[PDB]
Amino acid sequence: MTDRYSFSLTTFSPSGKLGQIDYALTAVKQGVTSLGIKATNGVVIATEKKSSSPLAMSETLSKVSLLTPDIGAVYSGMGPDYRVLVDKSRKVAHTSYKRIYGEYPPTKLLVSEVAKIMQEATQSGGVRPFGVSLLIAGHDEFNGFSLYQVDPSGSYFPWKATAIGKGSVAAKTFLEKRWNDELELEDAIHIALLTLKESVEGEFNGDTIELAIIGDENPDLLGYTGIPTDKGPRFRKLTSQEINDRLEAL
Amino acid sequence: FRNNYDGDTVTFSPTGRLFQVEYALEAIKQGSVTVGLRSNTHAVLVALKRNADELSSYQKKIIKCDEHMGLSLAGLAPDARVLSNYLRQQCNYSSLVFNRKLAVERAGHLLCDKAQKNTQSYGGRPYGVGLLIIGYDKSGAHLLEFQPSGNVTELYGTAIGARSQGAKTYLERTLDTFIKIDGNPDELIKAGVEAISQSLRDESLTVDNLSIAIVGKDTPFTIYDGEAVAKYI
Amino acid sequence: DRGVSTFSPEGRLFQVEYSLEAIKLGSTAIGIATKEGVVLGVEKRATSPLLESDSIEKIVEIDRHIGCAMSGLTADARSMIEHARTAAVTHNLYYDEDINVESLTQSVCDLALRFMSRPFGVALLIAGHDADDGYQLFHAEPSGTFYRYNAKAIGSGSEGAQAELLNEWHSSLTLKEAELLVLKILKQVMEEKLDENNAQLSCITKQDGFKIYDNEKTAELIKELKEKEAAE
Amino acid sequence: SVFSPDGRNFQVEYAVKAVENGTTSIGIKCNDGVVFAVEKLITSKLLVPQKNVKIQVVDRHIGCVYSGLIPDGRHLVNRGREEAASFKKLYKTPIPIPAFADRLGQYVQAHTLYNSVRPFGVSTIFGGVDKNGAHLYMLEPSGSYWGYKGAATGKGRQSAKAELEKLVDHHPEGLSAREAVKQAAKIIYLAHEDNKEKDFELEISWCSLSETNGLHKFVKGDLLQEAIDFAQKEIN
Amino acid sequence: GYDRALSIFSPDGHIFQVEYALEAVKRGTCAVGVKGKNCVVLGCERRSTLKLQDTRITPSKVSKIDSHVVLSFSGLNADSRILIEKARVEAQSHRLTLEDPVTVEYLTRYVAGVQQRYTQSGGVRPFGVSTLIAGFDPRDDEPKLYQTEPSGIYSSWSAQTIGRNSKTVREFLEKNYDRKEPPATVEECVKLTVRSLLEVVQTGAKNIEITVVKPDSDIVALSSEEINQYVTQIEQEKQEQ
Amino acid sequence: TTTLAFRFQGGIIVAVDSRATAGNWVASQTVKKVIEINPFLLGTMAGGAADCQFWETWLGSQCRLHELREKERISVAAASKILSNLVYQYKGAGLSMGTMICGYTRKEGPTIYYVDSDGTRLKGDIFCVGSGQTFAYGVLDSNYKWDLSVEDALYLGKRSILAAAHRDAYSGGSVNLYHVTEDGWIYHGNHDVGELFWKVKEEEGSFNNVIG
Amino acid sequence: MDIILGIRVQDSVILASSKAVTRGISVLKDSDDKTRQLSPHTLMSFAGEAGDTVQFAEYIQANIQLYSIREDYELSPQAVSSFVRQELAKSIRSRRPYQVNVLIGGYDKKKNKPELYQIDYLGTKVELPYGAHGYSGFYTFSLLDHHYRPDMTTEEGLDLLKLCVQELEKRMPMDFKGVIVKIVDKDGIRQVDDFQAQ
Amino acid sequence: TIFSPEGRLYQVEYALESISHAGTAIGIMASDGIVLAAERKVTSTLLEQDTSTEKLYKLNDKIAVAVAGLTADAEILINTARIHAQNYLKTYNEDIPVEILVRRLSDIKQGYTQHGGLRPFGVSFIYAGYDDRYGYQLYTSNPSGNYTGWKAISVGANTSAAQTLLQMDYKDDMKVDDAIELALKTLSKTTDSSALTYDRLEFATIRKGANDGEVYQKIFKPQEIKDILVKTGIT
Numbered sequence A: 001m002t003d004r005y006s007f008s009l010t011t012f013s014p015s016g017k018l019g020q021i022d023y024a025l026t027a028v029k030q031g032v033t034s035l036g037i038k039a040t041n042g043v044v045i046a047t048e049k050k051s052s053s054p055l056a057m058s059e060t061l062s063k064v065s066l067l068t069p070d071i072g073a074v075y076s077g078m079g080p081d082y083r084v085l086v087d088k089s090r091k092v093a094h095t096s097y098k099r100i101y102g103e104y105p106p107t108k109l110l111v112s113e114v115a116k117i118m119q120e121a122t123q124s125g126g127v128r129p130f131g132v133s134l135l136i137a138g139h140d141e142f143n144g145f146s147l148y149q150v151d152p153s154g155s156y157f158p159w160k161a162t163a164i165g166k167g168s169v170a171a172k173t174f175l176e177k178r179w180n181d182e183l184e185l186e187d188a189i190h191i192a193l194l195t196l197k198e199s200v201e202g203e204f205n206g207d208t209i210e211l212a213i214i215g216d217e218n219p220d221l222l223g224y225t226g227i228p229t230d231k232g233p234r235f236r237k238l239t240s241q242e243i244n245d246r247l248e249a250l
Numbered sequence B: 001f002r003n004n005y006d007g008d009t010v011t012f013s014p015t016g017r018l019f020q021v022e023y024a025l026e027a028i029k030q031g032s033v034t035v036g037l038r039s040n041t042h043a044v045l046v047a048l049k050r051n052a053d054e055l056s057s058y059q060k061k062i063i064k065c066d067e068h069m070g071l072s073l074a075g076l077a078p079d080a081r082v083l084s085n086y087l088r089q090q091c092n093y094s095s096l097v098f099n100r101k102l103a104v105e106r107a108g109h110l111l112c113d114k115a116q117k118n119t120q121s122y123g124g125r126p127y128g129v130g131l132l133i134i135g136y137d138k139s140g141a142h143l144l145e146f147q148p149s150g151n152v153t154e155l156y157g158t159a160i161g162a163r164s165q166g167a168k169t170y171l172e173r174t175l176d177t178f179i180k181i182d183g184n185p186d187e188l189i190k191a192g193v194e195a196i197s198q199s200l201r202d203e204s205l206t207v208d209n210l211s212i213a214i215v216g217k218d219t220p221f222t223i224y225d226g227e228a229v230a231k232y233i
Numbered sequence C: 001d002r003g004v005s006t007f008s009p010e011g012r013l014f015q016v017e018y019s020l021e022a023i024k025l026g027s028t029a030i031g032i033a034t035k036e037g038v039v040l041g042v043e044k045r046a047t048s049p050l051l052e053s054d055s056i057e058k059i060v061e062i063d064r065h066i067g068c069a070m071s072g073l074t075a076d077a078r079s080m081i082e083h084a085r086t087a088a089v090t091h092n093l094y095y096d097e098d099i100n101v102e103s104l105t106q107s108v109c110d111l112a113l114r115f116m117s118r119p120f121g122v123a124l125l126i127a128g129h130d131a132d133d134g135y136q137l138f139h140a141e142p143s144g145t146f147y148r149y150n151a152k153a154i155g156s157g158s159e160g161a162q163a164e165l166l167n168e169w170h171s172s173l174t175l176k177e178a179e180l181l182v183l184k185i186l187k188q189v190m191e192e193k194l195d196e197n198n199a200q201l202s203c204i205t206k207q208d209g210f211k212i213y214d215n216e217k218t219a220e221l222i223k224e225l226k227e228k229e230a231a232e
Numbered sequence D: 001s002v003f004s005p006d007g008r009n010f011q012v013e014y015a016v017k018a019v020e021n022g023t024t025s026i027g028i029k030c031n032d033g034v035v036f037a038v039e040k041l042i043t044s045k046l047l048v049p050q051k052n053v054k055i056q057v058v059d060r061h062i063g064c065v066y067s068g069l070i071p072d073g074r075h076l077v078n079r080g081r082e083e084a085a086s087f088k089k090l091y092k093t094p095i096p097i098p099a100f101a102d103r104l105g106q107y108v109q110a111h112t113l114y115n116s117v118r119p120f121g122v123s124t125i126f127g128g129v130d131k132n133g134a135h136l137y138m139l140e141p142s143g144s145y146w147g148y149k150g151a152a153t154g155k156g157r158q159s160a161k162a163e164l165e166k167l168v169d170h171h172p173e174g175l176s177a178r179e180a181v182k183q184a185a186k187i188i189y190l191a192h193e194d195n196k197e198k199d200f201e202l203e204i205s206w207c208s209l210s211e212t213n214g215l216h217k218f219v220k221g222d223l224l225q226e227a228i229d230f231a232q233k234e235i236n
Numbered sequence E: 001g002y003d004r005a006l007s008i009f010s011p012d013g014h015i016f017q018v019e020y021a022l023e024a025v026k027r028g029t030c031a032v033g034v035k036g037k038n039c040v041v042l043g044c045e046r047r048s049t050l051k052l053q054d055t056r057i058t059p060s061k062v063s064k065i066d067s068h069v070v071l072s073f074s075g076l077n078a079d080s081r082i083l084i085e086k087a088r089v090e091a092q093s094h095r096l097t098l099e100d101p102v103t104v105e106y107l108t109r110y111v112a113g114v115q116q117r118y119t120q121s122g123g124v125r126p127f128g129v130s131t132l133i134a135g136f137d138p139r140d141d142e143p144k145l146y147q148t149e150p151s152g153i154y155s156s157w158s159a160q161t162i163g164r165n166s167k168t169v170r171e172f173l174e175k176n177y178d179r180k181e182p183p184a185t186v187e188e189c190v191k192l193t194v195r196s197l198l199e200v201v202q203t204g205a206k207n208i209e210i211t212v213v214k215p216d217s218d219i220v221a222l223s224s225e226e227i228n229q230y231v232t233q234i235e236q237e238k239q240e241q
Numbered sequence F: 001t002t003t004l005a006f007r008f009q010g011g012i013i014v015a016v017d018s019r020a021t022a023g024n025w026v027a028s029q030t031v032k033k034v035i036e037i038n039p040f041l042l043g044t045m046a047g048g049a050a051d052c053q054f055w056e057t058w059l060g061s062q063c064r065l066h067e068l069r070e071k072e073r074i075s076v077a078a079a080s081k082i083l084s085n086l087v088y089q090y091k092g093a094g095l096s097m098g099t100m101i102c103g104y105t106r107k108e109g110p111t112i113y114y115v116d117s118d119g120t121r122l123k124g125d126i127f128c129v130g131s132g133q134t135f136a137y138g139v140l141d142s143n144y145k146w147d148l149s150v151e152d153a154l155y156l157g158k159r160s161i162l163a164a165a166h167r168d169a170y171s172g173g174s175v176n177l178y179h180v181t182e183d184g185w186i187y188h189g190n191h192d193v194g195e196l197f198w199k200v201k202e203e204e205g206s207f208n209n210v211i212g
Numbered sequence G: 001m002d003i004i005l006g007i008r009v010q011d012s013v014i015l016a017s018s019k020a021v022t023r024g025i026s027v028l029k030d031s032d033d034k035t036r037q038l039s040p041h042t043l044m045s046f047a048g049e050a051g052d053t054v055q056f057a058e059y060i061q062a063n064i065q066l067y068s069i070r071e072d073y074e075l076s077p078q079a080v081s082s083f084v085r086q087e088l089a090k091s092i093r094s095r096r097p098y099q100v101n102v103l104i105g106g107y108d109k110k111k112n113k114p115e116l117y118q119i120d121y122l123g124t125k126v127e128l129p130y131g132a133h134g135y136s137g138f139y140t141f142s143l144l145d146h147h148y149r150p151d152m153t154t155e156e157g158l159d160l161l162k163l164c165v166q167e168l169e170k171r172m173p174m175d176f177k178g179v180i181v182k183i184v185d186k187d188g189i190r191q192v193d194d195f196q197a198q
Numbered sequence H: 001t002i003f004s005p006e007g008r009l010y011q012v013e014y015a016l017e018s019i020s021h022a023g024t025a026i027g028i029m030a031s032d033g034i035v036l037a038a039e040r041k042v043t044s045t046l047l048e049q050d051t052s053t054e055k056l057y058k059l060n061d062k063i064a065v066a067v068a069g070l071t072a073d074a075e076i077l078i079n080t081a082r083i084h085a086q087n088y089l090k091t092y093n094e095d096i097p098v099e100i101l102v103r104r105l106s107d108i109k110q111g112y113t114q115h116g117g118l119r120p121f122g123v124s125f126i127y128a129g130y131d132d133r134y135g136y137q138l139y140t141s142n143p144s145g146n147y148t149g150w151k152a153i154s155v156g157a158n159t160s161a162a163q164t165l166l167q168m169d170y171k172d173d174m175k176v177d178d179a180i181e182l183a184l185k186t187l188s189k190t191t192d193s194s195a196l197t198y199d200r201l202e203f204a205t206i207r208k209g210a211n212d213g214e215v216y217q218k219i220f221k222p223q224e225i226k227d228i229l230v231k232t233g234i235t
């Protein structure tokens, strides 16, 4: 009992590298590919649902997660690391922002907070960095739609479009070709599905693809009527049925 | 095999040994000799003290613990202070809380448990001292041997320290004689003095060289040094 | 290279043994215990002639009846002195009497055990008087062990100093003889010529307590030694 | 806190060696209790006979005996005692044996989880009578324990285990407490075969529903001699 | 709870972290101090990695502790800020409880004490700093100069130097400084200081800086030009065949 | 209790009574209300007997410690401020003490500080402290001249305590007299009020309020 | 109640403080300085509960001197008074509040204005042309409301205080034993050590 | 946080080594303002430049920093510097003097150097700010906890190259617009890209705000950098 490793496990090498952060990035590279595209009226984030045996229930694993009603996240690298970050991020959106200002945080600031949690594991005693890269997509009244990437070091940066993981190089190139600053949302969904066809080996259907948007407010996903001054969550997981319908005319 | 397995006390060797504990045990062999023996009425400690120079003192090796109990040391002297102090407290706690003189056997169990913790906690070190514990309680006279491994054993007699095997051999043979020295302190002391002798290539044991402590039926624990021991050389 | 409180296969504590080495590199300190008093002398050893010699405090008062000389990493001695003083004043506060010299020493050695990240790099000669046991001299190592001595020397010149103390000490030395002997034995082992600036004398008497001799009274005894040793 | 590449914990494994190196000790379940027994090496003629008690009681109803590092064993029993006290305080009833087993289980197991603690160098045989029967348990340095009809650990464990196996096969009906006491004396004598450079003292304890009212008691005097005698008989 | 012991002994009885701390001192720019009959002077040097520096706002090497005591250092600059802060806090604390400002000896003992503590505590490294502390006791005229080092040893000096090439300047001072006759003028005491620094620095331009302390909290820094008046007087006049 | 200390031409006079009470019970007549801290420092005690004795005995311990640390007698200012700072830590917990720290040093000359358990610390020439203070002030203030001879100042102090011993129910016993110079304090004896009153009455012709 | 007065004239700030220290039925001292210099151009006067009064002043003094020595720079009166306010406002909610009221009189050298700040034990701060703490304010505020002019000289300000003191000697129940007067201008802090029989 | 036999701090030296690979930032101080210029690390077309901030951070209203090193490590230090400034303002009712804020960040850095067994932050700062004691000020801090004041300075990649050029073209009586020019010219010759374009720069000025007597912080937008690139002759 007691924590007896009170020093940093990520130190500087004589060349100025931080080994553990590099190795965490290597872990991300092995990860299943994931992407985000920012449109003019939305953002889309997508990944492959790499099943382990067909006996596993793919729907029961969350690869795309709601963080706040307007914010989503997806990842590449170590799933178990992502899952605990989603929990801590959801909680901090509350403790650090909603309990103070009575409104959910703007995307850049929630991202700032995840970034903080990941940096900490880069410098605290007795811990290793998280083996994930996150893609966070959201909207807020004052900054509109945004998309960010957070890395093992806690670095973040905003993208118009990007991908991470196994086939990241190939996909970044594919998007660069296809991205223009006038895309509707349905256009960006379509481009996301095309980019993701490369990554994937086996089946390519709605039960092997996890895809969510940040779009218009969904009043029927609120759960109550009568306060006309919110129309509801902008985050929306696409159903298996919705993915396939866009794949037929693909 | 002996390589990275003596780093700390919190590590087992592939043989199943704890080398740090074994090394602490080794501080005793290097320590000056002491003897303990008892009959049914009294228990006795005889400790040959060691000097640093001809100009130095013969560092005291017998520590009183209560009116009915005490010990002799061989090894790191500071470690004898830590433990005998803890024993003074346990004796004291027994007196205050329960109006009970603490049983020698319980004193043994308590020392064992204290030493044990240091053979298992990281950043700590085993005690580097062996102790001979005499006492008189409600079940009579007692001698105990403390090993820093946490092993304690009750005996009629024994010896620890430099060339202790000599005295321990003599005692193994003088057994049936001394055990019967009841109600006669001076002969039991003499039997202790003659036991310590079988462990001296050194020399003649002299006036400032010798230390004797005794506890018994109507005799409380008392240490004799110098003038008082002259009659035993 | 593994730990601080680690045992060697010979059953010694590595760090305690290496601290003893540091003490061997220290300036020489000598103590002589008589029936008229206890003398403590030291070698100042200025690392340069620009150093103001009388700013070298290697003999310090603890209580009026207890003084102490040090040798080794003298900076480590600060908190031992401080602790020694607190122990002696606290004792007087709780008991309305002088602390016994043996009790004071035992207390310092208790402090020594508390390794704090490392053992002390300094050994101490503690000298004084109490009603029970009279004039006493103590050597206190950073192991927590202490020893009573009629005479003792610690520091770089101690091997030769001890040998000389072995010949010269007897149970009838007067204080003034004892002063001369400390001075003599220091003159032999010091890597420099002994004068009133590179050596300091001190004593404790029952009547006058612990006094550091000022440079003038020392210079006189140096002059008296040069002469006592001319005729013989 | 270190797995070796084969999935084992190499520090636990070395702890086992230390146990294998210890004095031999046993437990036998009978039809209404448990008996315990141990080999006490007589290092010297100077040891006081009957006076270096290895067997320890927990609460009033649980016996504990062990092989390996004796201090490690005592630490474990101390903890067992607090775990017994804590249970009684909260739930009134004395601690059931399966429950007491998991308490030692988890504690011993905890000492295999962290790099700053070493595992225990004992295997402990313990048991007693609770509200629904007698129970015998053995717990290894990993924290692994199971129930047993018979159990042995220490230097002479193999020869002792073979003897136990024979009894189980030749007494499907169950053994008696009175009998198991004699049999335990036999088994320790047989087991001393693999440690005979020293003389030894025998120590036995038992917890029987009808012979002790379900409390742990030592076997002394008359009954201890009858057991020694019976064991001396089947060796000549 | 990080308490891993960094300052430990080696088999020959040396504490290598304390030793390498001294190495960092000898790496640092040179600092010197010399005391007069009625004064003490402190002198420093500057390096030349870059000279597009702003000198108004860059930390000067002589720091005021109280109004009557100053500290200059050789070694790691970042470490010295920490020793100075604590010395400043203590100086105020001594005034508050003793109703008197510190003696130079007392402030020295305190700073040396803090250095020592850092040589024997878990999970801390010694100070890569050695210091010169100078001034006058309150209501006293006799000048005071003390030196501390990473071990916690401290002592007083007629004159002393520390840092890079101090071996050289201690050489100069040992021949030139007379115990019989301290530089009785403020002026001639600034003389011995600039001379001693000239051996190491080069041209006494934007590199040599000087500070004078007189009794009763009288402490004046110099300007480039008033330094140049000393650079000039020695070069030309002590050039004679 | 009545205690006083005044500064004058020839140093400081310190005089105190020697009575302890509990309610109306006279507990003792032989109590020592002056503490000798070192040969140059005195403290006087008024208020709770234990509070005063304990913390002033402690004050002596802290003053000795300063001698060893700084190789120098502590200043009166700093000795008083140790007591004053300690007592302030305890403010509100109900300590009860009013004291004077008196002594000479080369830096300060003869100095008196009044220290009480409210945390008050004052430097001044003349203080009386205790239940009898007003009786003392009255005699003292109306006979005090800076130019008093040592003999006369000694008497004035003594007489002022007599005054308060007489009128204050919670004062009496005896007077203990001290004189403080550059050479340190000198004790000028114990004086039973039992004897002193009658002697003073006859010799001074005062106390005409008193029968016989 | 001790008397703590402050008047801000055109070129200086003047503080007058009562010299008496009274415990119970005795005036123990008639020459007390209820003032601490905080820096060469900032002066604080204080009244309130017995021990708290000096302990607080000297703690404030220590902090300001520290800052000065650390920055080789003098804090402005506005800054010092904010430090003090926040210190009191902390104290008011602690286990045992400091029961001290203060006047801070300083000369701001950057602005060349003199400044008077009144702060009570609760940490209530205000800047005023003249101020007072305790009962004394009940007489002086109105008196000064009548006689004060914003552009008075330091010599005129001292005549205004003389009125204030004389009024307090006519109407206050207790003998406060006269006042010590101190001036804070561009040249720093000085004492008019001759106010009583003048 | 341990010493080498030489008397240098391993983890620090290696941290500075880390910083030398970071996008270059320059600070230049005029008579009437400070310029902050910094270069982004090998970027992409898809990287959002509009809402992007990574090298230039506002600390309060009078003080900005330029970052060379680990972006996330700097986020930590920026946040606690922002807090310290607000603590100072709350305590004193005065904006924090530049030096004081700089000293505090440096003292934080120094800690990791000396105790706790945590790794230093891999970050260097250029501080540009104004206070009424010393006017415009430029400071620098690195992972050793060391801070110094500058007329002009650079940190990160190619400081040797950049430092040579600034000494060659800087002269005390400079105006802000000349300092802007000097900043961009120096980055033009020390870049690793083919040429310097707008989407690879962050730019900031601390001026005297035309006509007022009050201090203004301007962080140049994309389109604004693009423009100031035209005037100087880099298009």
Ligand SMILES: Cc1ccc(CNC(=O)[C@H](CCc2ccccc2)NC(=O)[C@H](Cc2nc(C(C)(C)C)no2)NC(=O)c2cc(C)on2)cc1
Pocket (backbone or CB within 6 Å): F001, F019, F020, F021, F022, F023, F027, F031, F032, F033, F045, F046, F047, F048, F049, F050, F052, F053, F096
């Ligand atoms: C050394 C010395 C002795 C005597 C004095 C003068 N004070 C005194 O004589 C004060 C006066 C009362 C008082 C005033 C203010 C606060 C508390 C108490 N008396 C004192 O402290 C008494 C002394 C005393 N008490 C008793 C008995 C045993 C209660 C009968 N016998 O003597 N203790 C108390 O009042 C006292 C009560 C409790 C509870 O704890 N101490 C000063 C200095």
